[PDB]
């Protein structure tokens, strides 16, 4: 009862469901970094490296961060199954792994950031793009949101000593 009923989990679960949609947006989107040689300008993506001059020619060649992002959506699938089973039998405890899965969904997005930040250094002029900024805010939503839902799931240190951690 008492975890789920307070609005503390209301605001925090809602914020997460924003960043879930942002995360699903940031994976399938194609604008991470601007290739700008000066033409044969392009945008790095997790699945496609599309060449643009107005002629748009999309293909692909950064292998690592693609397979990582599969794992990041895999926890976002599992992190929502546990949350939907939570509210329906007065079971509070399933928020405990559900807050865990969002954090690893956050960190594996952060790895996909720093691999793509690394592949720029391999290669001409570069700047970042909008879906990279989408992936930064999808991190902060999830990583703070998973931790805050973890803290809100656990009860209060016994404060006084005769009701320790139950």
């Amino acid at each position: 009862m008492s975890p789920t009923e307070a609005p503390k989990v209301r605001v925090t679960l809602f914020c997460i469901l924003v960043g879930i949609v942002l995360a699903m947006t940031a994976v399938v989107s194609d604008h991470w970094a601007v290739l700008s040689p000066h033409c044969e300008a392009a945008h790095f993506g997790l699945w496609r490296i599309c060449t643009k001059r107005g002629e748009k020619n999309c293909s692909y060649f950064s292998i690592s961060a693609a397979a990582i992002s599969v794992f990041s959506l895999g926890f976002l699938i599992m992190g929502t199954i546990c949350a939907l089973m939570a509210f329906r039998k007065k079971r509070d405890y399933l928020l405990r792994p559900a807050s865990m899965f969002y954090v690893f969904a956050g960190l594996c997005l952060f790895v996909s950031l720093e691999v793509m930040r690394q592949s720029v250094k391999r290669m001409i002029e570069y700047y970042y793009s909008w879906s990279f900024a989408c992936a930064c805010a999808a991190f902060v939503l999830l990583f703070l949101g998973g931790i805050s839902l973890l803290l809100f799931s656990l009860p209060r240190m016994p404060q006084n000593p005769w009701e320790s951690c139950m």
């Binding site: 690592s64 397979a67 990582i68 794992f71 405890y93 399933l94 405990r96 792994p97 865990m100 954090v103 690893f104 960190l107 594996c108 952060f110 790895v111 720093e114 691999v115 690394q118 250094k121 656990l154 240190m157 016994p158 404060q159 006084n160 000593p161 005769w162 009701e163 320790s164 951690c165 139950m166």
Partner: protein, 1276 residues
């Protein structure tokens, strides 16, 4: 175990062995050893002087006399005379040196040379009273054991995390083009590089970063090899040199990640030594609360000192009637002396004297030094008269009896002696300086004031005689380590180099400065890096000389932490005796929550301005974001004044609200002209201070501290007099010195000019030609104001060595330094440093003793038995049974029958320990066969730990498995490990995996899970995190204001490397200016940053400054700034010290010997054995077997079972419910009343209803009579 028990004439030896003065003959011969080892001058490569060569033969005297003694001690008793353990070392010292004579004949080696250092420990065992001290010093070490064992786990976590994150990262260099020389700039430490991104472009112009070794300090500050990681997170923990290990990583990886490693090592290293100092002060205070009940004896004491008060007074009534024309002069000497006049005639003289003695320049042009001599001549003529008027009209015997006027005798005589001795002329110029320093004692004339002065000296001088036992142990501790270090290092500081390794040990005083330097913590880093590099620099056998500078710094502080208690037990003995519309708006939720959200957006832009561009895109955005924000602000001060009016300024929050708003409005008047400027911008920072007065926690903390200042004020007013008195003796003795010429060979004014040669590295084939000028050593002693500056930094234990070693090297007025002239001027910096250490400690004890009064002020409302007797009632009245989540399904029940046992308990504890050492090894340039094994290991230890959470989840049936947080923490580790295995091997089909590795480390935190005595100490602090974080809010605010004030002001500051404002230590951005202030908050060489901000620094060629003005961006507000930051950091960190007394007070006043709740907390765990269904009602049959298995502090005897415990339980009014199922609460109350002593009926029923009144008085819930039904269960 006696030896043959014989009686020859040897029995007469026993009458001579133990006579009377046999102690005295052995005291006078061990003291000779102390001098025999003090004049031992060590020599570098097997050399011996003459006196060093004669003292080798003098050991054979002290070999045989300690053998003539000890063999007679054998003849005296025998093998049972190893009974004194302090005599057990006696034969131990001798039995090595007899082996040394054997190895002496092998020559016709230096390991036994070091054991003769141990001999003055015999000087302890001889002299008693120091048998009191060493016995008392080990008895403090029992309650400190859990604090010290968590710091031992604090280092091992941060050694493994710093080992795996930073292995091999430092080894890059910035060598020249292709050479072997490491490229530096003139002060720049040889700091690493990286060819790849984020760290050091290496712009030293003709140099390229190549592998090999640039390294940290010389090899000693790595992060590979478990022993170096653990060494360089040790040094970091002592807040000394933690910024080089930060700025080296931050130079090799790149910043913005590794700051979070060290500023959580400091913030946890601070917090768990901050509660080590409060650890020792727990164990000895509870002893002293048991002697506070002699309140009727101070009633006898203050009568006796009232009797001593009258008896001296009436006797002066007798005295001044006996010695009584000349009486007509007498009444004149009552009416002039005791009048209001000499309360004010003397001050004009005295305040005119302390301006005479503190004028004191270097040059004093010509007229000042004539006034110095006439004033002294004039003001003595008032001194004698003032004295002489007390000579006639006060009584002769009354005058000399007072100690303060006996002091005034020594003043007036010495003034006359020093004036006439100059007129005699026959006096050395060494002596007239001494006479000048004698006058300086007149400053205590001022102290005829201070009303509690006689209370104050009685506080301090009573404390010293509680320290003079321990302080003589501290001085004999610093001798053993000075005699040891002279044997290990002993002029091995040869090094074939040219830099000054100045704190060497090749002397007895130089090893007595140098030990006392690493004792006080200042710069023991550079010292340890020389003892390591003297032997074998870094290697196997050689870095075990770290162990000398560890035990010197741990034990040498633990002695000095024990002078902190003996004061505190002595200082505790004295403490025992339409306006409706504007009315809603101010009280609206729409407006208050508006402001709190608006403050946070006001200061987020004000945090990160540019702040040095003045033209860029980050300005035009913020100028629109600033002027629009001043509008709302001023709008708020309208709506407050339309509710009350002009009389609302009473509150201290509204006096600041009307101050910051009016200045932000005039910036719009100052922006109205540009279309004064930046001053009014910074007056907008005050805002969030208003939000601090909207916080309530601080009202308790800040108020309790200003209670403590009222009683310590007396001490603070004296300790700032000594910094004026030792300024004026410091000026007097070091005027015009510290005036050093650039090449150290020219020694005077005119001829330190022109160009010279600076020879690089070491050899005279790399001449560079620089100019030379006078360098003035920046913290000179010239003015009394300019000497309070320098003596303020040696007061904060920061930067004294460099300054101290300068004060040694000085000679006559305008002359450069001579190398080791007059080491006798190191006694100034020692006595003063020791003194200020003693007045800084008496303040600290004050803030402790005051708060332990102020917390017990809440428990003066007592009418009750005791604190332990208070909590155990609240432990019985409030507690409830335990889970006991026992399963059905005997397939599953067999699985649970394994998991909760000691099979899994001892096995999963075991495989962490193998997982520790698997992470323990992990060194650098390891083999590829070892890389293959630890990659398997990691895979092995994940499969086991995920097999833990499989078996437990199939046992605990999800409900219960998420219940405890430790299992939820395991689920965080397991998945982070599985995603660490997968991420590594997908790569084998990758730098980013460095975070996922941390998850591999966190398994060590599963260790403390079973460590029951440690977890109970962390959980105390999380429960204590109540009154702390509002005090932490003022810390954050403090760092926030001083960041923004300096960022506009100390920008434009030209990040030239080598000049201590550099690329790691910027003032420019906001988080670089927070870290700089965290450097000055832990005292890390803040004295340089002050000198970096000045008036003649460069101005960062991105700013404007367009003609000429290229060396005028420094702003000397820095002296007003770093000093005013340093006291406001010192005062507020004391409020962190006070706030930890606040909530931990129940833990710091414990008595874990009488009624420790560890017996209570374990007592719930026997209930799960016999009541497994959570019914909360036992049978009255198996309570009987439950009594016998607890522990004899809370259970019963091993004489089991009885008619005694069974007599006890029938002797308790134990109720029997339906069928005889008892609750735990009635049983808990009876079995706590077994220790909480009791009587028969009459006193029992009187204790019951009084417990009903006391609990209901405590109960703010006037409802819930089930607690009164619980007293019907516990009492009836």
């Amino acid at each position: 175990f006696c030896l043959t028990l014989q009686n020859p004439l040897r029995k007469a030896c026993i009458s001579i062995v133990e006579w009377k003065p046999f102690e005295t003959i052995i005291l006078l011969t061990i003291f000779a050893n102390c001098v025999a080892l003090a004049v031992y001058l060590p020599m570098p490569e097997d050399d011996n002087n003459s006196l060093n060569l004669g003292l080798e033969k003098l050991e054979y005297f002290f070999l045989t006399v300690f053998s003539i003694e000890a063999a007679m001690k054998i003849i005296a008793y025998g093998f049972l005379f190893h009974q004194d353990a302090y005599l057990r070392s006696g034969w131990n010292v001798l039995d090595f040196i007899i082996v040394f004579l054997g190895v002496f004949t092998a020559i016709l080696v230096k390991a036994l040379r070091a054991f003769r250092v141990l001999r003055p420990l015999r000087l302890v065992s001889g002299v008693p009273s120091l048998q009191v001290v060493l016995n008392s010093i080990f008895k403090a070490m029992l309650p400190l054991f859990h604090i010290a064992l968590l710091v031992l786990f604090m280092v091992i976590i941060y050694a493994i995390i710093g080992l795996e994150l930073f292995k091999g990262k430092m080894h890059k260099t910035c060598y020249y083009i292709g050479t072997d020389i490491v490229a530096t700039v003139e002060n720049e430490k040889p700091s690493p590089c990286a060819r790849t991104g984020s760290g050091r472009p290496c712009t030293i112009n003709g140099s390229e970063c190549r592998g090999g070794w640039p390294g940290p300090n010389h090899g000693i500050t790595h992060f590979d090899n478990f022993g170096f990681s653990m060494l360089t997170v040790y040094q970091c923990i002592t807040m000394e040199g933690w910024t080089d290990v930060l700025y080296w990583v931050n130079d090799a990886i790149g910043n913005e990640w590794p700051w979070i490693y060290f500023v959580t090592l400091i913030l946890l290293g601070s917090f768990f030594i901050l509660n080590l100092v409060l650890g020792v002060l727990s164990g000895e205070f509870t002893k002293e609360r048991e002697k506070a009940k002699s309140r009727g004896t101070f009633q006898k004491l203050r009568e006796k000192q009232q009797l001593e008060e009258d008896l001296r007074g009436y006797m002066s009534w007798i005295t001044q009637g006996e010695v009584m024309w000349n009486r007509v002069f007498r009444w004149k000497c009552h009416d002039l002396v005791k009048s209001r006049v000499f309360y004010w005639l003397v001050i004009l003289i005295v305040a005119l004297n302390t301006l005479s003695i503190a004028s004191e320049h270097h040059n004093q042009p010509l007229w000042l030094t004539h006034l110095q001599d006439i004033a002294n001549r004039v003001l003595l003529s008032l001194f004698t008269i003032e004295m002489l008027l007390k000579m006639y009209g006060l009584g002769l015997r009354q005058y000399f009896m007072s100690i303060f006027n006996r002091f005034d005798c020594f003043v007036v005589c010495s003034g006359i002696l020093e004036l006439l001795l100059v007129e005699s002329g026959a006096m050395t110029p060494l002596g007239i300086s001494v006479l000048r320093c004698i006058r300086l004692l007149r400053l205590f004339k001022i102290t005829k004031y201070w009303t509690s002065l006689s209370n104050l000296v009685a506080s301090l001088l009573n404390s010293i005689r509680s320290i003079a036992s321990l302080l003589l142990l501290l001085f004999l501790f610093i001798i053993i380590f000075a005699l040891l270090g002279m044997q290990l290092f002993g002029g091995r500081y040869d090094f074939e180099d040219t830099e000054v390794r100045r704190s060497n040990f090749d002397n007895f005083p130089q090893a007595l400065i140098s030990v006392f330097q690493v004792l006080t913590g200042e710069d023991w880093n550079s010292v340890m890096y020389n003892g390591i590099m003297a032997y074998g620099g870094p290697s196997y056998p050689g870095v075990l000389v770290c162990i000398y500078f560890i035990i010197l710094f741990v034990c040498g502080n633990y002695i000095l932490l024990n002078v902190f208690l003996a004061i505190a037990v002595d200082n505790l003995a004295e403490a025992e005796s339409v306006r409706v519309l504007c009315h809603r708006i101010v009280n609206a939720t729409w407006f208050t929550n508006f402001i709190l959200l608006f403050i946070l957006l006001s200061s987020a832009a004000l945090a990160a301005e540019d702040p040095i561009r003045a033209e860029s895109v980050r300005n035009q955005i913020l100028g629109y974001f600033d002027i629009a924000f001043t509008s709302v602000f001023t709008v708020e001060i309208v709506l407050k004044m339309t509710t009350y009016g002009a009389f609302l300024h009473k509150g201290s929050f509204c006096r600041n609200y009307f101050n910051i708003l009016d200045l932000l409005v005039v910036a719009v008047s100052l922006i109205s002209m540009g279309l004064v400027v930046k001053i009014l911008r910074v007056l907008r920072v005050l805002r969030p201070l208003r939000a601090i007065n909207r916080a309530k926690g601080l009202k308790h903390v800040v108020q309790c501290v200003f209670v403590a200042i009222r009683t310590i004020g007396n001490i603070v007013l004296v300790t700032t007099l000594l910094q004026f008195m030792f300024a004026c003796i410091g000026v007097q003795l070091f005027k015009g010195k510290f005036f050093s010429c650039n090449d150290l060979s020219k020694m005077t004014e005119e001829e330190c000019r022109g160009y010279y040669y600076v020879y690089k590295d070491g050899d005279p084939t790399q001449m560079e030609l620089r100019p030379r000028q006078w360098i003035h050593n920046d913290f000179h002693f010239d003015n009394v104001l300019s000497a309070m500056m320098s003596l303020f930094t040696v007061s904060t234990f920061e930067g004294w060595p460099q300054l101290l070693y300068r004060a040694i090297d000085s000679n006559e007025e305008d002359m450069g330094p001579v190398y080791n002239n007059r080491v006798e001027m190191a006694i100034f910096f020692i006595i003063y440093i020791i003194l200020i250490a003693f007045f800084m400690m008496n303040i600290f004890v004050g803030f402790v003793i005051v708060t332990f009064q102020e917390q017990g002020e809440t428990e003066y409302k007592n009418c009750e038995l005791d604190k332990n007797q208070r909590q155990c009632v609240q432990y019985a009245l409030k507690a409830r049974p335990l889970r006991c989540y026992i399963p059905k399904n005997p397939y599953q029940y067999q699985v649970w029958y394994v998991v909760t046992s000691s099979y899994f308990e001892y096995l999963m504890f075991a495989l962490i320990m193998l997982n520790t050492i698997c992470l323990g090894m992990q060194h650098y340039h390891q083999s590829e066969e070892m890389n293959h094994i630890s990659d398997i290991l990691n895979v092995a230890f994940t499969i086991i730990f995920t097999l833990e959470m499989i078996l437990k989840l199939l046992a605990f049936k999800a409900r219960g498995y998420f219940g405890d947080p430790w299992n939820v923490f395991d689920f965080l580790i397991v998945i982070g490990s599985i995603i660490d295995v997968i991420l590594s091997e997908i790569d084998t089909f990758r730098i980013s995996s460095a975070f996922f590795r941390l998850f591999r480390v966190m398994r060590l935190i599963k260790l403390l899970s079973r460590a029951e005595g440690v977890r109970t100490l962390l959980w105390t602090f999380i429960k204590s995190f109540q009154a702390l974080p509002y005090v932490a809010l003022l810390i954050v605010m403090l760092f926030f204001i001083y960041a923004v004030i300096g960022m506009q002001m100390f920008g434009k500051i030209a990040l030239v490397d080598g000049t201590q404002i550099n690329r790691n230590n910027n003032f420019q951005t906001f988080p670089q200016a927070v870290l700089l202030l965290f450097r000055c908050a832990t005292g890390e060489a803040w004295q340089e940053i002050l000198l970096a901000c000045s008036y003649g620094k460069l101005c960062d060629p991105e700013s404007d400054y367009a003609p000429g003005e290229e060396y005028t961006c420094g702003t000397n507000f820095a002296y007003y700034y770093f000093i005013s930051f340093y006291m406001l950091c010192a005062f507020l960190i004391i409020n962190l010290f006070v706030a930890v007394i606040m909530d931990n007070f129940d833990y710091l006043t414990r008595d874990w010997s009488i009624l420790g709740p560890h017996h209570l907390d374990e007592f719930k765990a026997i209930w799960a054995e016999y009541d497994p269904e959570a019914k909360g009602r036992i049978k009255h049959l198996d309570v009987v077997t439950l009594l016998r298995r607890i522990q004899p502090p809370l259970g019963f005897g091993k004489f089991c079972p009885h008619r005694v415990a069974c007599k006890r339980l029938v002797g308790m009014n134990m109720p029997l419910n339906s069928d005889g199922t008892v609750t735990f609460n009635a049983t808990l109350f009876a079995l706590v009343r077994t220790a909480l002593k009791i009587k028969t009926e009459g006193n029992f029923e009187q204790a019951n209803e009084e417990l009903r009144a006391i609990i209901k008085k405590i109960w703010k819930r006037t409802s819930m009579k089930l607690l009164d039904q619980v007293i019907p269960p516990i009492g009836d």
